[PDB]
Amino acid sequence: REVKLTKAGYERLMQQLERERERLQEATKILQELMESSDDYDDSGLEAAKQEKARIEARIDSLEDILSRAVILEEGSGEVIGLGSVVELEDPLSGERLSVQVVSPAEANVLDTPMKISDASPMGKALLGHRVGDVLSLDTPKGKREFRVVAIHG
Fold first, then answer.
1. Domains assigned to the chain
2. What's this chain's function?
């Protein structure tokens, strides 16, 4: 599917990619050291090292995919998230899709779909004023996750 990013969204993901490449270099060094180690009680350490390297590689592949196919949108384009806005989000690393609607505190209900999020909550305040293409780190009921804003509507 097409990928739209604002200049800020692209910037955030590229910075994240740079950090992930750093982690990959470190993870690779660790793996190499263990492969050349002379004291091997068992392979638990090697397996963990390979698992971490793979975890990082998967994130890098997802980031490179999104960044390489992204179309950079013009600033101040489309709708902007406010009270009443229904927002479609997509995790750039997992592809998971989630939708939410920013509502007044008294209308909040995290069990609905879209999730009715209070504009006064950490997630709500983090969404206010953003546009399609922006990339945000949100405090969801499942924890902290990164999402790209895919659509905004009534």
1. 1-75 (1.10.287.180), 76-149 (3.10.50.30)
2. Inhibits all catalytic activities of RNA polymerase (RNAP) by partially occluding its substrate-binding site and preventing NTP binding.
